[PDB]
């Protein structure tokens, strides 16, 4: 698992469950091509997005559909989605976790890149 | 001043100065049209992006050039940029401040929205 | 103004108004002596805590009353308060702004430090 | 494991390893009594702090010794330590994770409370 995503809810202090996540890779013409997607699990995680084979160096965008998450809970959100855009570089450690902490009018995101 | 951006640096404990910021508005054809841009001042603030007249209803993307910022300071960053995407003004004009706190492998952003 | 505090609310997208803040200074006997306190204004800011004269070298604890804030707004919070502990002025006077962003089960804080 | 602590480094995008963590419980006289402590592991985690038996309702303070962490890495920090102070309440879910994300002049902390 070269790429994993973890999403938490700062209002309830819980995983953010069943949140849609779409990953895209930047194509030669600068457009964003779909690459992987899924919904977070009961633990706020999303595994099995890719394989080492498909996960080549490039620029990637992770879009987390936070607006749908909050609206379904009856809480008015500010963002359309949260976005994380980064270059994957084979020079550093192998595994990337993209963690996001959601509030209705804020979010934070960190990357943990380990071997 | 209906859209402002404030950017802080969590490594140095300072405003993030001379950070490029681009704002785009989603067009009828789902492409991202340029809308406004500028650079943060010595206080980490960016005013003057737009006017109540120009800042119509719409989906806007504020993209903060975090990677150039960290590279200028000599520090290896993870993200290409930090993006904040939101629907604006759909119940009338509001004033938006978008604040972001930057670290090399993390950032946060928040919005403060007031009704004029 | 050598110590200021700014507090934002990440649920409402607004400044956090009327938030109580207490500052303590560590005493020679390792107890926390009261130093200054006040409440955030309509802009989420708190000025006037102290003066360059009174703000001597020392270890300070800034405690922001997040629990009362969330309880007033009708929202169940996790923390008792948010605490920021730091050595101040040990190479001469500096100006400190302590910014905090509040959610019911999370908060962040950052310092901006400038040399006068 | 009723209480776990997870610490990440926002400068390197990695777990914050070998960081000292001390937990205290507020005593009847308002003083802080030691309760548990340890150092984070290679994964930035710290398990086995307490048992359900000792972890009763009360007010707890988690102090994470961030100044020692940064100074050893040659990076000048602002805080003495990061502190998380909260009441444990048996009314909600059982397990508490206290997560902290460290930068030299900032930190964020969240709690994930699950069953």
From Swiss-Prot, chains B, C:
Sequence positions bearing 4-carboxyglutamate: 33
Keywords from the named record: Amyloid, Amyloidosis, Cytoplasm, Disease variant, Gamma-carboxyglutamic acid, Glycoprotein, Hormone, Neuropathy, Phosphoprotein, Secreted, Signal, Sulfation, Thyroid hormone, Transport
Effect in UniProt of substituting residue 75 to N: In AMYLD1; vitrous amyloid
GO BP field: negative regulation of glomerular filtration; phototransduction, visible light; purine nucleobase metabolic process; retinoid metabolic process
Effect upon mutating residue 24 to I: In AMYLD1; Jewish 'SKO' amyloid polyneuropathy
Residues listed as glycosylation sites in the UniProt record: 89
Molecular function, one GO term: hormone activity
Tissue expression per record: Detected in serum and cerebrospinal fluid (at protein level). Highly expressed in choroid plexus epithelial cells. Detected in retina pigment epithelium and liver.
Phenotype for residue 11 to I: In AMYLD1; late-onset amyloid polyneuropathy with carpal tunnel syndrome
Reported effect, residue 75 to S: In AMYLD1; amyloid polyneuropathy; almost no RBP binding
Effect noted on mutating residue 62 to A: In AMYLD1; amyloid polyneuropathy
Annotated positions of the Sulfocysteine modification: 1
Result of altering residue 41 to R: In AMYLD1; amyloid polyneuropathy
Result for mutant: residue 55 to L: In AMYLD1; amyloid polyneuropathy
Effect of residue 60 to H: In AMYLD1; leptomeningeal amyloidosis; vitreous amyloid in some patients
Record note on quaternary structure: Homotetramer. Dimer of dimers. In the homotetramer, subunits assemble around a central channel that can accommodate two ligand molecules. Interacts with RBP4.
Misc note: Tetramer dissociation and partial unfolding leads to the formation of aggregates and amyloid fibrils. Small molecules that occupy at least one of the thyroid hormone binding sites stabilize the tetramer, and thereby stabilize the native state and protect against misfolding and the formation of amyloid fibrils. Two binding sites for thyroxine are located in the channel. Less than 1% of plasma prealbumin molecules are normally involved in thyroxine transport. L-thyroxine binds to the transthyretin by an order of magnitude stronger than does the triiodo-L-thyronine. Thyroxine-binding globulin is the major carrier protein for thyroid hormones in man.
Family per similarity comment: Belongs to the transthyretin family.
Name of the protein this chain belongs to: Transthyretin
Lineage, uppermost ranks: Eukaryota, Metazoa, Chordata, Craniata, Vertebrata
Gene: TTR
